[PDB]
Design a protein around this ligand. Sequence first.
Ligand SMILES: Cc1cc2c3c(c1C)C(C)(C)CC=[N+]3c1c([nH]c(=O)[nH]c1=O)N2C[C@H](O)[C@H](O)[C@H](O)COP(=O)(O)O
Ligand SMILES: Cc1cc2c3c(c1C)C(C)(C)CC=[N+]3c1c([nH]c(=O)[nH]c1=O)N2C[C@H](O)[C@H](O)[C@H](O)COP(=O)(O)O
Ligand SMILES: [K+]
Ligand SMILES: [K+]
Ligand SMILES: [K+]
Ligand SMILES: [K+]
Ligand SMILES: [Mn+2]
Ligand SMILES: [Mn+2]
Lengths: 499, 499
Amino acid sequence: QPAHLCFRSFVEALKVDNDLVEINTPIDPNLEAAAITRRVCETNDKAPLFNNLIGMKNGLFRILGAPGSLRKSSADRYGRLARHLALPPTASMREILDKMLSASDMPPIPPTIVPTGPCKENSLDDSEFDLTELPVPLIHKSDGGKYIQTYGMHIVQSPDGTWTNWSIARAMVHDKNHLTGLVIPPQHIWQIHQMWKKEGRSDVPWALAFGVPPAAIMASSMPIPDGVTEAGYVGAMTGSSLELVKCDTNDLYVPATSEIVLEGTLSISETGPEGPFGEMHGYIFPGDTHLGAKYKVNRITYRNNAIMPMSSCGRLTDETHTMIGSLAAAEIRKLCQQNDLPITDAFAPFESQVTWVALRVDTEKLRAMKTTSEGFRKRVGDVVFNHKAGYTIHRLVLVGDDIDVYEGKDVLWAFSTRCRPGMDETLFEDVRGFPLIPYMGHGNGPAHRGGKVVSDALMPTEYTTGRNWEAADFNQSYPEDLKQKVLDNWTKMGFSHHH
Amino acid sequence: QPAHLCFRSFVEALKVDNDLVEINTPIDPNLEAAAITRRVCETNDKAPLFNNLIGMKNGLFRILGAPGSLRKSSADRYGRLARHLALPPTASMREILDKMLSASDMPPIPPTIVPTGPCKENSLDDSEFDLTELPVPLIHKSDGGKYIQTYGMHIVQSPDGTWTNWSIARAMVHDKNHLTGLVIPPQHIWQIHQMWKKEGRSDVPWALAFGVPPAAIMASSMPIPDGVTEAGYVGAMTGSSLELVKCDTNDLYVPATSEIVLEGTLSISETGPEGPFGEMHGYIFPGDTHLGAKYKVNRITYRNNAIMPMSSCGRLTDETHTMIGSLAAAEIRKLCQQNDLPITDAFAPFESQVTWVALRVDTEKLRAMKTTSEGFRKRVGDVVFNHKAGYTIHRLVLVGDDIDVYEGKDVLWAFSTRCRPGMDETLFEDVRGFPLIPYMGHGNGPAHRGGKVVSDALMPTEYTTGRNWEAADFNQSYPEDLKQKVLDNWTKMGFSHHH
Ligand SMILES: Cc1cc2c3c(c1C)C(C)(C)CC=[N+]3c1c([nH]c(=O)[nH]c1=O)N2C[C@H](O)[C@H](O)[C@H](O)COP(=O)(O)O
Ligand SMILES: Cc1cc2c3c(c1C)C(C)(C)CC=[N+]3c1c([nH]c(=O)[nH]c1=O)N2C[C@H](O)[C@H](O)[C@H](O)COP(=O)(O)O
Ligand SMILES: [K+]
Ligand SMILES: [K+]
Ligand SMILES: [K+]
Ligand SMILES: [K+]
Ligand SMILES: [Mn+2]
Ligand SMILES: [Mn+2]
């Protein structure tokens, strides 16, 4: 099976790329696996495959850390993400985000039901497993539980059957047969949960599949529109119908090559302690436990020699930055364009801890609109901050065509030099806020509302007659023939891609 | 003579450090020297010494570019600055800024007058020089003149004789015997000029010395207090009285080893076209010429084989970042402390284009103050933004003790995650603004007023009971013994100072 369609093949691809370290000696899931992974993520090293996890039994489980993190070299920096999508390892972020958006104006390709697959190789009924006995990692020393779920896909379906959602939401072990996790607005797992709660008749049929097709985990992490079944979006993106197998204990369908599948129910009534967890913004607040959603596990199925992917999330750079931020930015770009806003590109700078999105403006189109900063900022912020795709993002930075929004140095330059604090900004207090940002949930104001801003780093003439500066840089401050001469003589004089 | 006391010895020090490239073939001062220098500054390469400048005649002049720019390696990143000050090349920014502040609670050591020095080796009277015939560089292609003055020291004295100021302010060639330049409030050259204007009786006696003692050019660039003679501050910092020689045509005193000295007058009545110039924030606005101050040159004296230092300023990183930003930050740190504010450290992040200063707070002291964010931000911003040391800085970021303000990644992390836009900020519209920032002088609001902000990246419990988080990073999220084990086994497992 191709790497983008099969997690086991993806692992092989990483090995073949010299982008994997296999660790065959015993590693403790209590902190050690996650510490190694954390160090990988902070240094852009090779992904760790833990083949010898202390507590592994009857095939459950090995661990792959850092599945969607960065590589060291600039040339293949996003290669691990490219390997989720059948793209060349040198793909740019623009190419990755375009691939993720491509299915948005294509017919879905619905999944294909097959009778069996590798995920059925082994099974454990409700007398034969205990979640507390598996080698579930403790990822950060102050976590409030062992977070089994950091890179699997939750599967829930609307009561009417018409929408099946795939998403990544965290969850930890509660006891032998239950998990607790976040189920919060405006996420689609929450929206579907609310539908079942209003019906009031049963718990939500649920499955959680780990080690799913890489293209599917990417779509899981993306805020594609309400009511759109991710399986058919992934089918259209990849050009192929995804092969799914029915669960044994409910009528949901999971990817045939899933490494590990949990089947059960998400309660419409019960809750349990959840958190704290070391989160995407780089913090944990020890002791901050709150009631979360509660999942009951009735059955486990799994591949021979099953591998559990894990995100050791926190400070830069891991899957929470590369996937949450970038994929939100992609959706925001599309949303802007669909609202007739002249946005060409969007990216969440890593430097902002993916709390900003920089929006590149086609300034020729802007000039035709004959508008002003105040008006334009308000329009952009209303579109984005009133939409689910804007949920995680608290600052939008508008920049003109000279800025590469995929280069954080350039975004920071433009923000710092072109946006006058206060005057060139519009604050949004009556929008949904992202409580996980420390200044929100642990800050001075409402955790769930406000704290958002549009920062206009467009210069005045960008709205009227066109850019009226040149950069004071080597590229712009010297003629072509001179630059080339300098470059050609550089090493001759005495001065100093792949790598 | 030691390197910090003699520019010619400083050049030798750079050579001996393997931090100099001597270019002995012809180089054009029209753009080429500055293009090479620009590329150096953008890549942190070795400083260029142009020994063969097209247009050099009778000893005027060679050029040294990038005298205060960065080195590539982390270990000696600030080594060129350290060489201005007799510090080891591995000195930290903290050590550099402490050295620059050291003279602030020492008695001045006034200069010593000597009868002659190298700066008298050659001379040109007002029948023998023409500024338009010297190899003055065109630094950026759209500059409005040839900017002879980018790293020399202007010398002016109050009418009463009691304050002699040394500073760096730009100036360009106007004609055979005049320069034009910026003389703007609140700079000390402007303050002294105003004194002479109010007296109304003559033009200001002036000298401009290039290739001065490195320790003197550093103090030139620093906003030490009103009324303090830089020569005596430098004497106290270095522990030695600086040797000065009288000008030939006026009674000002210049460093004995100056490479090149211009003597003349700064007019109290006349102006001439000045600018545009490619500036510290990374921009030039072609055609933006305005009237500037006008200097008349009556005499030139110079060393044999004189060397003119040049800053090819613009986008990161050059002397305008390393010196303007850092030295302002140093003075701000002291100002805060003298106003009883619990500030330990200050630095202007390069990422902010040195428009921000991050202020590290001693949070134990803050807690004792029993205050709030709103109150504390206002107090800090009043002290700093009402003072000349705050002139160039438009955003102050308050951070707690865990943040190294000399590391821009950490400042950006804290700003993005701990300061809620709007709520956690105080805007200052009734303070002096820095018009050279594009969003000021070319922006939507008054060029000279407002546009400043205090951004509080202190978390709520930092004011009350103490930090209540741990970072989700390798350092903080794992115990000591584990970290050490991971590190010790890193290369064994398969994973990857001076450089
Ligand atoms: C890649 C990724 C995405 C996480 C995520 C993580 C990763 C690694 C974690 C597991 C390591 C930590 C927490 N995460 C959660 C999360 N969204 C959410 O609601 N709760 C979470 O608890 N997301 C973001 C969520 O997947 C995206 O917002 C999707 O748009 C949600 O899909 P949906 O649009 O169908 O609701
Ligand atoms: C290092 C450095 C400092 C420049 C400077 C440059 C460099 C390289 C340039 C020459 C390349 C470009 C412009 N600069 C000017 C400038 N200050 C100013 O008023 N006008 C300028 O035109 N400064 C900043 C000024 O030197 C500091 O603000 C000092 O505090 C001024 O000394 P003072 O406190 O005694 O007034
Ligand atoms: K999704
Ligand atoms: K603006
Ligand atoms: K000075
Ligand atoms: K704050
Ligand atoms: Mn969805
Ligand atoms: Mn001064």
